[PDB]
Each structure stands twice: as C-alpha cells, then as structure tokens.
Design an enzyme around this catalytic site. Structure first.
Site, PDB file in Angstrom:
ATOM      1  CD  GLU C 100      -2.629   1.352   2.600  1.00 39.16           C
ATOM      2  OE1 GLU C 100      -2.078   1.186   3.708  1.00 39.16           O
ATOM      3  OE2 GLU C 100      -3.864   1.565   2.486  1.00 39.16           O
ATOM      4  CD1 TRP C 122      -6.122   0.709  -0.235  1.00 38.13           C
ATOM      5  CD2 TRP C 122      -7.759   2.237  -0.226  1.00 38.13           C
ATOM      6  NE1 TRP C 122      -5.673   1.797   0.471  1.00 38.13           N
ATOM      7  CE2 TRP C 122      -6.655   2.749   0.493  1.00 38.13           C
ATOM      8  CE3 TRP C 122      -8.911   3.025  -0.344  1.00 38.13           C
ATOM      9  CZ2 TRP C 122      -6.668   4.021   1.092  1.00 38.13           C
ATOM     10  CZ3 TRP C 122      -8.923   4.293   0.256  1.00 38.13           C
ATOM     11  CH2 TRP C 122      -7.807   4.773   0.964  1.00 38.13           C
ATOM     12  CE1 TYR C 148      -3.961   8.900   3.762  1.00 38.27           C
ATOM     13  CE2 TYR C 148      -5.239   7.088   2.840  1.00 38.27           C
ATOM     14  CZ  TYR C 148      -4.934   7.946   3.876  1.00 38.27           C
ATOM     15  OH  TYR C 148      -5.597   7.801   5.058  1.00 38.27           O
ATOM     16  CB  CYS C 208      -8.231   7.101   8.387  1.00 40.68           C
ATOM     17  SG  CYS C 208      -9.875   6.416   7.999  1.00 40.68           S
ATOM     18  NE  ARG C 228     -10.998  11.177   8.130  1.00 38.30           N
ATOM     19  CZ  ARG C 228     -11.931  10.232   8.188  1.00 38.30           C
ATOM     20  NH1 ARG C 228     -12.661  10.064   9.281  1.00 38.30           N
ATOM     21  NH2 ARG C 228     -12.123   9.448   7.146  1.00 38.30           N
ATOM     22  CG  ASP C 231     -11.231  -0.552  13.727  1.00 34.91           C
ATOM     23  OD1 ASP C 231     -11.307  -0.978  14.899  1.00 34.91           O
ATOM     24  OD2 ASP C 231     -11.594  -1.220  12.743  1.00 34.91           O
TER      25      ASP C 231
HETATM   26  O1  LIG Z   1      -5.935   2.556   7.734  1.00 38.39           O
HETATM   27  C1  LIG Z   1      -7.024   2.666   8.306  1.00 38.39           C
HETATM   28  C2  LIG Z   1      -8.274   2.839   7.553  1.00 38.39           C
HETATM   29  C3  LIG Z   1      -9.482   2.953   8.260  1.00 38.39           C
HETATM   30  N1  LIG Z   1      -9.542   2.912   9.615  1.00 38.39           N
HETATM   31  C4  LIG Z   1     -10.951   3.046  10.138  1.00 38.39           C
HETATM   32  C5  LIG Z   1     -11.429   4.259  10.950  1.00 38.39           C
HETATM   33  C6  LIG Z   1     -12.964   4.099  10.931  1.00 38.39           C
HETATM   34  O2  LIG Z   1     -13.316   3.057  11.899  1.00 38.39           O
HETATM   35  C7  LIG Z   1     -13.350   3.615   9.511  1.00 38.39           C
HETATM   36  C8  LIG Z   1     -13.614   4.777   8.529  1.00 38.39           C
HETATM   37  O3  LIG Z   1     -14.832   5.518   8.927  1.00 38.39           O
HETATM   38  P1  LIG Z   1     -14.912   7.073   8.984  1.00 38.39           P
HETATM   39  O4  LIG Z   1     -14.120   7.425  10.150  1.00 38.39           O
HETATM   40  O5  LIG Z   1     -14.412   7.667   7.766  1.00 38.39           O
HETATM   41  O6  LIG Z   1     -16.280   7.523   9.155  1.00 38.39           O
HETATM   42  O7  LIG Z   1     -12.075   2.960   9.119  1.00 38.39           O
HETATM   43  C9  LIG Z   1      -8.375   2.748  10.459  1.00 38.39           C
HETATM   44  O8  LIG Z   1      -8.364   2.700  11.709  1.00 38.39           O
HETATM   45  N2  LIG Z   1      -7.164   2.633   9.728  1.00 38.39           N
END
Ligand SMILES: O=c1ccn([C@H]2C[C@H](O)[C@@H](COP(=O)(O)O)O2)c(=O)[nH]1
Ligand SMILES: NC(=O)C1=CN([C@@H]2O[C@H](COP(=O)(O)OP(=O)(O)OC[C@H]3O[C@@H](n4cnc5c(N)ncnc54)[C@H](OP(=O)(O)O)[C@@H]3O)[C@@H](O)[C@H]2O)C=CC1
Ligand SMILES: NC(=O)C1=CN([C@@H]2O[C@H](COP(=O)(O)OP(=O)(O)OC[C@H]3O[C@@H](n4cnc5c(N)ncnc54)[C@H](OP(=O)(O)O)[C@@H]3O)[C@@H](O)[C@H]2O)C=CC1
Ligand SMILES: O=c1ccn([C@H]2C[C@H](O)[C@@H](COP(=O)(O)O)O2)c(=O)[nH]1
Ligand SMILES: CCc1nc(N)nc(N)c1-c1ccc(Cl)cc1
Ligand SMILES: CCc1nc(N)nc(N)c1-c1ccc(Cl)cc1
Lengths: 326, 216, 326, 221
Positions: C100, C122, C148, C208, C228, C231
C-alpha cells in the site's frame, strides 16, 4: 510490599542520572515549583511542559541565529465546562485575539483591518520586506494571502487579492463543519483545515494551527487543535485562549455545551531569551481560573462582535515580559 | 523530641474565602495576591450563601478517618502529654449552622465560648472557656484529627498562638459582600504545598489549596 | 510523610467510584492484565488505550447501526531506534501495508494494482456500489480518486482518472519534504498532508491519516502522524506499523537515523463486536518487539520494492479474529 | 504463618535467555510462548557472546542495595533463626562452570559476595576471595551468618534447576534476548502454576538485537 519497590529501581537501570540542561537551568531556581507535592491545577499542564522542555529540550538554532530548546509531541486538555483556561501565572489580554478570530470568521485576509483596530498580531508578516523575502514581490503590503480566513471560507478558490469578492467560491468549511455537527454529530470527519498545500507559498506564512477536529457526545462539544509550531513562552498562552474561545462559539451556535479543548503540540519550543522569565513564572502558584461568558443571543457563527465576549473573575499574577531585553 | 502542640496534637484549620467588594470600584483588581481571597462571612452567614462542591469538600475532609494510622498518633500523644475527628468552632459560628445539621455528624463538636452552658448541651457535644483549654479536652478524647472550622476570631488567635499545622483553604473565585474576614496568612510562617483541580459549582469557579506550617 | 498522603485522599473527593461500563465490562475478565505491577513494554501504550476506552468510553452508533465505544485525543510514542512496534499480543502480517505504502509513493490511485498483488485493503471502497453511494457515478470501479498517492505527489492538480499521467502537475509534497529534511532540518514546516479539502468528495473516502510532520535533531528523524478516525481493534495495529516503516524509509533516503514515531489519535473507538476479542488480547503479555531492516542500498524514496523490507525476530501470540462472527 | 526459606533470606534468580536453534520442521507458522526463550549457554559461554545492555542490567540488579531497608531484613532473618539481641552487599551464587566462564579481570564479581557451588573443587583450588560450598544447605547456613542485602542465583542451568526444584526462588529476573543462537544448555521450563509474570519492562536494542526484562514471582498456594 517493598518487594515490588526495588523492582522499580531495576527497571530504571538505564536511565540518565541527571536531566540534560539541568546544568543550564539550575534547581534552587524552581524552588517553589519543586516544593509542591500536588499540582492538579490545569495550568500545570502548561507549566509542566515548560519545565520539561527547559530540562530536557534539544538545543537548536533557527536559520536566524536565534536559539531555542525544543521537544516533539505534547498534548494538553482543558475542561471548558469547569473553567476558562486563561493562564493565571502572568497577565494575558484577549481583545486582540478575539478580533483575530472574528476576522478569520469573516474570511478576511486583509491585514489593514486588524491594524486599524490596533491588533498587530500579523503586522510584521505583512511588511514590504517580509513579503519580498517570501518571494511575494507581487503582493500588496498587508495582503497576507490565502491564509486562515480564506481557507475557512473558500478552500480551493483561486486567490487574487484581499479585496476580491469570493462569494460562493471554494469550499466553505466553516459552514460545513457546523452543519455536520448539527446534522451528523457522530461523524469523524468534522475537520476545519487551514493547511492548503497548494496555496502555502502564496501565504505570508504557512498556518501554525493546522486544523481543528470536533467530537460530539451527549450534547457536548470537544475540540482538538493540532499546532505544528509552538512558541511556548509567548504564543501558546494565547493559542490556548483563542481555540478555547472558538470552541465555545461553535458550541453555542450548535446548541451544545462546550466540553474539552484538546491542544496537540508538534514542534514545541522555548526561546532561549524567555528562560529567565519562564523560571520566574514557574515559581508562581496559579489562581483559580476565570470563566468566559458569551452573549447567549448569538446563534450564528458570523454574528459575534467584540462586545459579545466577557471574561469573568480573572485573578492573575503581574505581567512578565518574556524577553527582558526592552 | 515532641513538644510544639500544633504538630504534636494534630490541629488543622479549614476555611473557604471569596473575594471582597469595595464600594469605590467593585471589580477587576489592579493587583492580586493570596490575600485577595479573604471573605469569610456576611451577617451571620456565608457571603455566597451556599456552594455544594465546597460543602462536600468540607464534609469529606472533616469526617475522613484512617484508623490504621491512629496509633502512630495515640503513641506519641500519650507519650507527649468509631474514630471521629474534632471540629472546633465559635459561638457565632455554631449559631449559624442550621438546626437539622447540628451537631455536625460523625464529628466531635467543640466550642469556644465565655457564656455557653455546658450544663445545657449533650456530652458527645463539649464546650471550652479558652483556647488553651482545648489542648486539654484533646488529651482526654480519642480523635483522629482536630479541625478549626472558624470563625474569624477563632482563626486569628489559633494562628497567632501558632497552633495551626495545615490550612485547607478553599478559594471561592467570585465577589460578595463581606463583614468578617480571614487573617492575612504570613507567607513566611505558612506556604502552599498543594493546589487542586479547578471546578465550577453554583455558578462560580473554585479550587482547594493546602497551606503548610513551614517547619522552618 | 503520611498526611502529605491524606491530602491526596481529600483531593480525590469528587470522584465517581466506578468506571462507566464496569458493570457492562467486568474485570475478573482482565485478571492477568490487572495483576501486573509494572507494565512498561511499549505495547501497553496501545493496550492501555483499549482498556481506557472500554472502561470510560462513550457509547455511540458510529455509522448507522454498528455502535462503538469512543474517546477523543490520545498520543502514543514509539522509539524506532530501539525496536519496530509490530504488536505481539496478536499476529500481524505486513506484505499488504508495505505494498500500500509503495503504491502511495508511486502516486497511484488505481485499486487494480493492489488487487493484482492480492492486497484487498481497498477492495470494498472501490466497488460499483460503494462508489455510487458516495455519489461517484462517473467513477470507474476501483478508481479510488484523488486519495493518498495523488495528494502526496500532485496535491492541487485536477484529478481526472487513475490512468492519467499527472506529470509536473500539482505539488509533489513527498519530494518537497525530503528536500526540507536534507537542506533545512530545523524547519517547522515539514508536513505531508493528505487531507485536501477541495478533493474530499471526489475520494472513495476522506483520509483517516490526515498528516505527518517531521522533526530533525542531531541526525535523528522523528515523525508525528495525526489520525482523525481510529479503529483500535483492527486498524490501529496496522497504522502504527505503516507509519513506522514510512518513518524508516524517509530517514534512510535522507541519511538520518529513525528516532520516534508519535501517533496522535483523534476519534478513537472500539467496535462493540471487537470487545470480547480485545478482552482476550489484553490478558496476553507482550513479547519483545521485532526489528525492521531496509535494504541499505536504496537512496531514493521512489526506489523501494517489496523485497527491500524484512521484519526480524517477530515473536507473537496466536492470531485473533477481532470479529468472532461465523 | 509458616516461613519459607526463600522469603526469609530473599533468594532471587536472575538470568538471560535467547531463542533456540530450531529444527525448523516445515512450519514457519511457529507457535510461541514463554518457553521460546530458553537458551542459556553454548560451549561454556553465552550463546550471543556479549550484550552490553543485559550486562549493565545484570550488574545494576546484583549490586544494588538499600541500607535503610537492611535492619528490617536483619530483624526478620534473625527472628526466624531465633537469634535476637564494611559496605552492605548482595550475594551471588553460581555453578562452577559459570565461574570458569568469567574473564580473569572480572573475577570475583565486583562489589558482591561471590559464592560458588561445586564438588570437584574446594577452597584450596581458588586464589580468589570467594566462598566455596558443596550443597544447597550450606548456602542457607552461610546466609544466616552473613550481613548481606539480597541473594541472587546467577546460573548455570544445573544450579537454576535445583534451586527451583527445592522451591527456594522468590522471584526470577528474566532477560528475553530476542534473537536465535546455537545453544547446548537451557533454562528449565517455568511451571506457570508456580510462577507468574508480574512486570514487563521497556524494549531495547543492543548488539543488534532487541531484548526486554521481565519478572516472575512465586504464586498463591
Ligand atoms: O488505515 C485505516 C483505515 C481505516 N480505519 C478506520 C477508521 C474508521 O473506523 C473507519 C472509517 O470511517 P470514517 O471514520 O471515515 O467515518 O475505518 C483505520 O483505523 N485505519
Ligand atoms: N467561610 C468560612 O470558612 C467561615 C465563615 N464564618 C462566618 O463568620 C461569621 C462569625 O465570625 P466571627 O465574628 O469571627 O466569630 P466566631 O463565630 O468564630 O466566634 C465568636 C465567638 O467566639 C468566642 N471566643 C472569642 N475568643 C475566645 C476565647 N479566647 N476563648 C473562648 N471563646 C472565645 C466568643 O464567645 P462568647 O461571646 O460567649 O464569649 C465569640 O462570641 C459567621 O457569619 C460565619 O458564617 C465562620 C467560620 C468559617
Ligand atoms: N544467559 C544466562 O543468563 C546464563 C548462561 N549460563 C551459561 O551456561 C553455562 C553453565 O551451564 P551448566 O553447565 O549447565 O551449569 P553450572 O555453571 O550451574 O554448574 C553446575 C555444575 O556446578 C556445580 N554444582 C551445581 N549444583 C551443585 C550442588 N548442589 N552441590 C555442589 N556442586 C554443584 C558442580 O560443579 P563441579 O562439576 O565441580 O562439581 C556441577 O557439576 C555457561 O555457558 C554459562 O555462560 C549460565 C547461567 C546464566
Ligand atoms: O498563534 C501563534 C502564531 C505563531 N506561533 C509561533 C511558532 C513559531 O515560533 C513561529 C512561526 O514560524 P515557523 O515555525 O513557521 O518557522 O510563530 C505560536 O506559537 N502561536
Ligand atoms: C461549607 C462551609 C465551610 N467551607 C469550608 N471550606 N471551610 C469551613 N470552615 C466552612 C464552615 C463555615 C462555617 C460553619 Cl458554621 C461551618 C463550616
Ligand atoms: C551478563 C550475563 C547474565 N545476564 C543475566 N540477565 N543474568 C545472568 N545470570 C548472567 C550471567 C551469566 C553467566 C555468568 Cl558466569 C554471570 C552472569
């Protein structure tokens, strides 16, 4: 009981015996600061960082010949529901930073507007010599370029000059984050970003406050502001006030109660010239914080006026000039 | 070698002061300092009437007891001469306390007076004719810590004679009308060793600070 | 001194007594985690956050229906000079995130490239349905838009499609931050930002990972990354690895040694469905971290290939399916 | 209370262990556990030569003493022996092979009371200021006559094995050297029911390998 106590000493076996520039900072000096057993007053979040940088900061020299002590990555949190975080260990003024905020909200980039109100925060950044050294030979004096206000209300628009009517041009992020907070509060995309990579070279100078991200829970609003460069002794104190005020404003126009203002510092530094003043400040004991009162009738982010802001019960130590030079 | 009563017998002072209003100009003092917070009471009552956070603090501090640490105290005290703390107050002070709230629960209520009839009140509710008579009532009772809860007159003498170990000072950060004040603490006899978090209660911010007897 | 201790008891007089979801979470569950006295292994920076969110997190419905426990504002720090922070309390593979990353560096936005390398990070975001629901009806399947890769090398250019050669269009931030680190190390403007306000609606989804800021001192490079949305159970473990590798790559092509990777978490959440699994993970004791080795002959950020990366001595616990649904 | 020798005399064990050279059998889907770190030595010496950080840790732990906490230990040990009424040092007990593996410039271990376990050797076979004992019982007797802070068992495997057998170890300061080397001697598998990890340190890098320090503590019942 003490069983696990010696274990503490073993785990610290590879630690530096003395603090780095302790040699240059000198402890009989911070003798009231070190005499305190419990420092739970929030102002210590700021004071502890000054102490940390002074004692462990890295010596660096700007390309100016000026010197600083710097560290990378800190975070402070202030509970706006319990107090207004206006530093009490020295005297701080807010008329100017409030006007700067109102100026951002209007989307202005016209340096004269602030000068005519005797708010000189951006004066040095708009002189003929400063713009030329930024290679902005074709920029009018005090025309700061596509900075904050332009980015908050017109991100993506093509900047022309500070007098142009940019109505409906670019992305009005200010309007968008507010609408997101009202209609989609659990969104994790409520960001207000001033760092427009395409426009950087056109700005009098890149923004120090990169972005603001908001969080909404149980009718309460929190805000995180990421600062890429922090002048601990002079700028940060005002930085905390500005964004704390902004947080209250956004919160009130969205009918939410303010919660926490979270300050994230990137390059956090202390100018060598501020050290003596900061040592003095570190030995002062904070007074209980004051509160901030906003005119409750203002329900639109754009309707605030200087008279709508009131700082109440501000008790503070006497002013200190960070640079004792004159 | 144990003979300076204050440290010796464990006497502490606890108060809450607000800012004072001056008729000539009421606010935004030009110069502030620790003395800024001296409002104690107004016409028999607190200048701010009531503050539930400070109420909770006051109560939690005066009723808290750690029994395991009681013989370290029974020890030297005996050696010098349902564990509850002692709360020494004045008459004007005792008369200000409401009905349902007297005496203060889980506390050994004491009183400084020249006219109160010991004959009249309970036994678990003692009185004394003079300051020095307190030390005495202590050498007889079984308590954890002794708290001088006011008022002004009582604070003053206890400070002058130097019987106060620590001062649990609450800073009410708002201005009110006052008629009685706390005695200007001597920065060289007492020093601030702790400062709490800041809170908002009853529409005013406040915090709690601890003053210590510079053993020095 | 023991009463200087009682004061402590007083100062804590306004607590609650129990943590929010205590009843819901139950601690005989973190028996091993709570039995430890000194938890100094860096992996606990991530495990303590999970424990904090589970114990004090706010309950919300993040995306309609799902539901999470969330908190706002956290900072983790990893000393890359001392180890590579690949979580050991569960099993992780890095071939996908490295591809990636290289994909990012090439400036690609073509999802098919990853899919051809059997990397599905993706895939879900590039389907006909996902794109249509983002209102991107005129976007080809797997054409992720100006994400990105595109922002890193062409920020500000008008995005057309994933096959377009955007040569000398827009700002090549990636190259610019490499030159600032080499020629102006003390600069406080070394930021790589993926959050292009103007291009958000054109992206399969807003980044993110908002930005990366670099710090240089005594030949060592540190990096702060502001996220921002986080997870904690599934994303973060990989995000920490992703950026730590990136920090190493940038450090090497700039002739510096990697120092610290500082992760700033904005909206940090734990999906309810991951709770049981995370409870198991928290009761696992970390193993010493592994190390990362890059092919030392690579001197240009654009010259790295998948075989230039080796993770060594990775000792880990059994892999865990965060989602135990079958 | 029934006082156990390991507590009265504060007998602790401290070791360093790396990963063993596996007969990788066709599975780089290897399983891992605490036993993964069991390599103690190879051909009389450390499997990894030297590790300055581990060395530094070993020295800090085995030489650290807190004099203000001694008197408390004194009264206790004396109370247990029914015995009641110039710098303080710790004791280090090692097997003969461990002793011989130490460079001459480092023997006896500086600032520590050195005790060696052996049958083939006696006090006459040594020039150094060290104590030679030929049985575990002799150590306990020796500790009841000496003024020392703590007693550390420093190896080798044989010595470790019997001290754990006899149930004389209060805690185990274990260094996990995160790399693989050729080994011919190993640390005994710790019975997870008898010992539990109570602390984990920060991770470090030294001599091209990461490592960390953990502490095991004898359990309940
Ligand atoms: O590299 C990554 C990509 C995505 N997410 C997570 C954050 C959120 O749980 C979800 C995207 O939802 P939004 O925050 O955009 O609403 O994917 C990560 O932690 N790391
Ligand atoms: N904010 C705070 O923390 C506090 C506020 N207050 C406020 O202050 C007001 C009362 O203040 P103040 O005037 O100082 O008086 P107090 O109520 O503290 O005490 C007055 C009484 O103390 C007795 N007394 C004085 N000297 C002696 C002595 N040497 N021996 C024995 N008894 C003695 C007298 O009893 P008699 O006349 O019989 O001789 C006198 O009437 C109230 O409004 C109260 O609410 C009070 C305490 C704390
Ligand atoms: N990495 C680490 O933390 C450690 C590594 N090691 C390594 O292992 C090697 C030593 O291994 P190993 O041979 O297993 O062991 P030891 O060094 O423990 O030696 C045991 C042998 O020492 C003597 N001994 C042990 N127990 C007794 C007893 N109860 N009474 C009398 N004598 C006793 C005997 O000596 P004699 O034959 O005279 O009778 C016995 O043959 C070295 O390579 C060393 O570096 C060792 C400890 C720690
Ligand atoms: O509101 C502000 C504005 C500026 N600064 C400081 C940070 C730096 O010391 C200087 C900006 O210069 P650069 O960091 O961009 O070089 O101004 C603050 O702390 N707060
Ligand atoms: C809640 C009032 C309070 N708060 C604090 N912090 N200190 C005190 N000494 C008192 C108090 C005042 C008058 C009486 Cl009569 C009893 C107690
Ligand atoms: C530095 C090696 C080392 N590290 C640790 N953590 N523990 C040990 N017991 C030793 C050790 C091994 C052999 C001898 Cl002979 C002496 C000490």
């Amino acid at each position: 009981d003490d069983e696990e106590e010696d274990d503490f000493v073993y785990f610290n076996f590879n630690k530096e015996k003395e603090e780095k520039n302790k040699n240059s900072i000198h402890p009989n000096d911070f003798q009231i600061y070190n005499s305190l057993k419990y420092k739970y007053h929030p102002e210590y979040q700021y004071l502890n960082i000054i102490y940390d940088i002074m004692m462990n900061g890295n010596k660096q020299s700007d390309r100016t010949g000026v010197g600083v002590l710097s560290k990378f990555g800190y975070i402070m949190k202030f509970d706006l529901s319990q107090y207004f975080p206006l530093l009490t260990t020295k005297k701080l003024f807010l008329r100017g930073i409030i006007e700067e905020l109102l100026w951002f909200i209007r989307g202005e980039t016209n340096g004269n507007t602030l000068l005519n109100k005797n708010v000189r925060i951006w004066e040095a950044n708009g002189t003929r010599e400063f713009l030329d050294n930024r290679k902005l030979f074709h920029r009018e004096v005090n025309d700061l370029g596509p900075i904050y206000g332009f980015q908050w209300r017109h991100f993506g628009a093509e900047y022309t000059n500070m007098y142009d009517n940019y109505e409906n041009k670019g992305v009005d992020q200010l309007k968008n984050i507010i609408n997101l907070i009202k209609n989609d509060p659990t969104s994790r995309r409520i960001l207000l970003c001033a760092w427009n990579v395409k426009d950087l070279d056109q700005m009098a100078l890149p923004p120090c406050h990169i972005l603001c991200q908001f969080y909404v829970f149980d009718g309460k609003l929190s805000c995180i502001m990421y600062q890429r460069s922090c002048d601990l002794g002079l700028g940060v104190p005002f930085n905390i006030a500005s964004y704390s005020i902004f947080t209250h404003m956004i919160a009130q126009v969205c009918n939410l109660q303010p919660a926490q203002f979270i300050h994230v510092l990137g390059n956090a530094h202390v100018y060598n010239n501020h050290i003596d003043s900061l040592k003095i400040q570190l030995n002062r004991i904070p007074y209980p914080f004051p509160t901030l009162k906003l005119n409750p009738d203002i329900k639109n982010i754009e309707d605030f006026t200087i008279s709508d802001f009131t700082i109440q019960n501000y008790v503070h130590h006497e002013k200190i000039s960070m640079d004792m030079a004159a | 070698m144990m003979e300076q009563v204050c440290d010796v017998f464990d006497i502490y002072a606890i108060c809450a002061c607000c800012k004072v209003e001056s008729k000539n100009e009421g606010k935004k003092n030009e110069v502030f300092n620790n003395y800024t917070f001296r409002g104690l009471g107004n016409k028999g009552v607190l200048p701010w009437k009531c503050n539930s956070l400070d109420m909770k603090y006051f109560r939690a501090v005066t009723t808290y007891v750690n029994e395991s640490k009681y013989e370290k105290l029974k020890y030297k005290r005996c050696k010098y001469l349902k564990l509850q703390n002692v709360v020494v107050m004045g008459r004007t002070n005792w008369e200000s306390i409401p009905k349902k709230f007297k005496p203060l629960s889980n506390r050994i209520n004491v009183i400084l007076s020249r006219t109160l009839k010991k004959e009249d009140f309970d036994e678990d509710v003692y009185i004394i004719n003079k300051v020095e008579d307190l030390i005495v009532l202590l050498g007889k009772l079984n308590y954890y810590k002794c708290f001088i809860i006011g008022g002004s007159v009582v604070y003053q003498e206890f400070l002058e004679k130097k019987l106060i170990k620590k001062i649990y000072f609450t800073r009410i950060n708002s201005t009110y009308e006052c008629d009685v004040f706390f005695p200007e603490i001597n920065e060289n006899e007492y020093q601030i060793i702790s400062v709490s978090d800041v809170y908002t209660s009853n529409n005013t911010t406040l915090d709690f600070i601890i003053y210590k007897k510079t053993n020095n």
